[PDB]
Amino acid sequence: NLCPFGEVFNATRFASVYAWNRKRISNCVADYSVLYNSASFSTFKCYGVSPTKLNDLCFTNVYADSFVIRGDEVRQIAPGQTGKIADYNYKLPDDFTGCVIAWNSNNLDSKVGGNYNYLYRLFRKSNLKPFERDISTEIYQAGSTPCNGVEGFNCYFPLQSYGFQPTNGVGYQPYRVVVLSFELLHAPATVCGPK
């Protein structure tokens, strides 16, 4: 069983981070070194496992989550991070075992004048739990007055557009992100059996 990573990394569309996509993959074999050694990735960070030991992980399922964020937010896709992305859009668990892979996607996801397609959540009444998703669009009450469905002072639409422009600096350009999380019997995967 070869892991179907072609569908993940080379998907025809990528989700907004607030509506991040999850593909659930059963136990499978993959050549992780062709991924980890690829110059096409600007980030390849692993947690609870080293990239050279991915082939030896024992797991039941791997979740492949994917989305678009801007470059200076890739650092937030890690356990224990804070910020608008980690707190209100996509949150990893403390015992995350797997890797975070990103690459610059300016050539595909920017548009002259702005891209209105990719969004992120700006405000929330509480932080997301790990792997929670929130696609609601209720007006966010930042002040002392109920918004009651009207936008204005201290009453904000909760999503913001990235407006990815081709001439943005690299920290404001779009990056596609794939998060692989490995689970063994609903616990984190480990390198099991004879060492």
């Epitope: 930042a142 002040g143 002392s144 007055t145 109920p146 009207v150 204005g152 002072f153 201290n154 904000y156």
Partner: antibody
């Protein structure tokens, strides 16, 4: 026509107490949070306090917390600011303001508090 | 509290001129900065919120910008009614806090 009418100011002796009132008319009072702002003679604006539309959350400027209490009686459509142990730093024109989605869109006329012997 | 500092404290200009007023927050306040106008002895008037959104009815010659800690109010083509004191106010976290004000006076 939204109206906010303040009362309760005047000359008051140091160490005493007072309550300013801000009587609301022409709108659903209980749908709006309310703020107090002040301006000492010849000085700039100072934010004083805010109370939630439903009277729950209340917040205060660092310099007034503990001695000032903001409150509201929605059954009487009235906002209040109560000051204990008055001192010279409290002398100021006090304004109430409505917080709406439109902004701070309506204000009281102001009431002058003069702390003096 | 978050300290707000305006600059200059006073400036002079003439009808038809463009003027720029600066407001700096000692801590990051994102884009949640308001601007007010006050004439002597009169009630303040709320002009701008969230750094750049005009209240309804406010002339677009008033233009707010900035984010984080540095913010500006730019008044293009001054009209006689514009000479007045202008105050910023951060509305990002409690307690809300005003800058000390900038007085816009008539040059001669």
């Amino acid at each position: 026509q939204v109206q906010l009418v303040e009362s309760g100011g005047g000359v008051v002796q140091p160490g005493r107490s007072l309550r300013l009132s801000c009587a609301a008319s022409g709108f659903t009072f209980s749908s709006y949070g309310m703020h107090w702002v002040r301006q000492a003679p010849g000085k700039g604006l100072e934010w004083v306090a805010v109370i939630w539309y439903d009277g729950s959350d209340k917040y205060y400027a660092d310099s007034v917390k503990g001695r000032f209490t903001i409150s509201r009686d929605n059954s009487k459509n009235t906002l209040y600011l109560q000051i204990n142990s008055l001192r010279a730093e409290d002398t100021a024109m006090y304004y109430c303001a409505r917080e709406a989605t439109a902004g701070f869109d309506y204000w009281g006329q102001g009431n002058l508090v003069t702390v003096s012997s | 509290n978050i300290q707000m500092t305006q600059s200059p404290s006073a400036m002079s200009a003439s009808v038809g001129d463009r003027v720029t007023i600066t407001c700096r927050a000692r801590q990051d306040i994102s884009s949640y900065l308001a601007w007010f106008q006050q004439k002597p002895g009169k009630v303040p008037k709320h002009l701008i919120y969230a750094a750049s959104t005009l209240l309804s009815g406010v002339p677009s010659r008033f233009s707010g910008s900035g984010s984080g800690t540095e913010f500006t109010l730019t008044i293009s083509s001054l009209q006689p009614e514009d000479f007045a004191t202008y105050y910023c106010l951060q509305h990002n976290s409690y307690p809300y806090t005003f800058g000390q004000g900038t007085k816009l006076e008539i040059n001669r």
